[PDB]
Automatic annotation (TrEMBL), chain B:
Any single Pfam family the record assigns to this protein: GAF
Name used for this protein in its record: Metal dependent phosphohydrolase
Record-annotated membrane-spanning stretches: none
PROSITE patterns: HD_GYP
Positions bound to succinate 1: 180, 223, 226
Positions contributing to succinate 5 binding: 303, 339
Source organism (scientific name): Persephonella marina (strain DSM 14350 / EX-H1)
Length: 363, 361
């Protein structure tokens, strides 16, 4: 016997999957799979618009690249420009149809149903299309209603996926650019700030931290030197060696960083604050400001020592050319259990090629 | 038919994919449960790690209600993880009949299932009450609810995630804009409020809700370039001379440099506000002397909100201006310092400005 709620459940299930997916590629996939099943159609395609290349595009197979689709021709095109539904009972009795996919693969297209996709403000942003109804000879009035409702969901989840990406990207740009405010009074390039996070990301990832803490270090670590805004010019700008009144001030950037950052309530800023105050501590317990020992340093500080030191050693600094892999490996191998967490050092060594490819690919 | 319930679910799921407020998401979910399960009421309960209780919202988004996490029906499902199907609430020892006693409701059937996070901890309870047949929840019913509960977990977890991202994005803009705090008197709250004023201004000025959110978060970075000013100036204990003043002016350029080139919209606007906020509508400002609509609108809104905040803050020997005093000032500055069309809008809403200034002291 049959299940009355069968499709309802399928649809709940797709809706859970799509709600967890942050990747537009997979959202488009799951959407088309969903439509094929609920519409009982052999195929489906979502078409979206590109402002800059001025065309529609679509992904044909799982995991292969955009296909450009001419905004002005074909069925999709017509729907896109006019705003209205096309229901082709037979595709071959229709001039707007290009039999060319059809020529080559062993496939005959019979029925086509295509509706527009609207953004929140009623602009047509693309087309949703299904092909070859399986449990009937044509697409019905109800099929149209159904797809109109699907197009509504496709739109919402598509936009929401894009908007989460924009906000994620902005949040990064803001940490990067503001973290580099010290730049008028410190040689450190933009990319130093970025790269330190990228290394610490790999580390946290491979030490097996939760996926969220991985994204956290990636973004907390770059703020490690923010305290430098609180250092006197006479000290921050002085080239070469520092006396022992000046160094004592320069060390204080760890405490300043804490001050700047500890005030938030977000986890990002609790982590960033800890990193700022900790990343010059040392596993031995010798490093400043407090001489914290082993596990007394948070793991996020520990990951940041390693990353901070790596990035410095592999850049030209006054009188020292950047270290190659071989020396850097020798150095970490030496400092294992000394400057650094021994466990994290191993992980770092396992992953050293990636560190260097980050370093090479970000000038 | 039976495409009716799919069309309903797509409808609710469209609303939910857009909704960025948790409380609204819980409302939509419980209305979906009601239509999909053909039942009269539905509640969602979430756990607070902090207060160590469950909570729920009722319709109208009034203050959330504490529910005892240990006892009760949601308490049982929460603690044990088992499903509860009651055929008659009033024959059950675990039911609390006071919600009935106050509302005048009569609870008959209750079905409650747990909600799970990805790591598979119980994070709350989904509860459906009074199936519209007047008879029991069936196994096919329980089964539909396990699936609904799965969608609710997802949309919830997603929405709590989005909120963490929002809240941290703000904290970072605020805390890092106040990075000048070791070398400059401007307060954390000054920085926030300037964006709050700009927000209200942008909204009432007609801008899209996305641009309103932007100015709320861009304007607080207007003074970032102060970081680049030499101590021999920013920290000079005197008044400055003209050579030193010219270097001060540069924090506008320094800001633009720090912020620009960012690919995203937020930073384009911030970089513009930073270079523009000391320009004046009549072209007598600095650093470039831009006139009228050559100053971007986000700049124009910030000039206004920044001056507003200054005039209304006490400094020694100089009490803050009150409402009347301040309004006179903006009227006198219309078309000079400030964009006239925008001052008017600002004036229509000046009570809101003082409210902000009053609560975020
Ligand atoms: N063993 C070894 N470790 C290295 C070397 N170069 C960098 N590091 C490591 O990298 C950390 C941060 O270095 P940085 O990026 O140059 O960032 C430095 C740098 O900007 C500044 N600094 C350190 N020494 C001097 C100095 O003599 N003059 C000036 N102007 N600044 C200095 O203070 C920051 C913190 O430095 P540290 O507390 O020493 O902590 C250092 C140190 O452990 C090296 O050649 N050998
Ligand atoms: Fe440091
Ligand atoms: Fe200022
Ligand atoms: Fe300024
Ligand atoms: Fe200001």
């Amino acid at each position: 016997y049959q299940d009355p709620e069968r499709k309802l459940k399928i649809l709940l299930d797709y809706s859970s999957k799509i709600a967890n997916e942050k990747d537009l590629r997979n959202v488009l996939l799951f959407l088309t799979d969903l439509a094929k099943e609920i519409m009982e159609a052999d195929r489906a395609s979502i078409f979206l618009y590109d402002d800059q290349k001025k065309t529609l595009w679509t992904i044909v197979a799982h995991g292969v690249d955009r296909i450009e689709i001419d905004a002005d021709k074909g069925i999709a095109g017509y729907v896109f420009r006019t705003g209205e539904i096309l229901n082709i009972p037979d595709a071959y009795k229709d001039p707007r149809f290009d039999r060319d996919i059809d020529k080559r693969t062993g496939y005959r297209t019979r029925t086509i149903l295509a509706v527009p996709l609207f953004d929140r403000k009623q602009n047509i942003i693309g087309v949703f299309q299904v092909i070859n109804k399986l449990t009937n000879s044509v697409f019905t009035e109800e099929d149209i209603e159904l797809l109109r409702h699907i197009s509504l969901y496709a739109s919402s989840t598509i936009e929401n996926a894009i908007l989460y990406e924009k906000l994620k990207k902005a949040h990064e740009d803001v940490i990067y650019r503001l973290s580099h405010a010290t730049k008028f009074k410190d040689p450190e390039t933009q990319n130093h700030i970025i790269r330190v996070g990228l290394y610490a990301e790999i580390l946290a990832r491979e030490a097996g931290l939760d996926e969220e803490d991985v994204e956290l270090v990636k973004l907390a670590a770059p703020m490690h030197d923010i305290g430098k805004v609180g250092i006197p010019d006479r000290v921050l700008l002085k080239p070469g060696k520092l006396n022992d009144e000046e160094w004592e001030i320069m060390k204080k950037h760890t405490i300043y960083g804490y001050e700047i950052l500890k005030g938030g309530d977000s986890r990002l800023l609790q982590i960033a604050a800890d990193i700022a105050i900790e990343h010059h501590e040392r596993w031995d317990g010798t490093g400043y400001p407090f001489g914290k020992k082993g596990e007394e340093i948070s793991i996020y500080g520990r990951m940041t020592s390693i990353s901070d030191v790596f990035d410095a050693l592999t850049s030209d600094r006054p009188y020292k050319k950047a270290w190659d892999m071989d020396r850097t490996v020798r150095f970490f191998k030496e400092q294992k259990g000394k400057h650094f967490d021994p466990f994290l050092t191993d992980i770092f060594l396992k992953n050293i090629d990636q560190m260097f490819s980050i370093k090479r690919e970000l000038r």
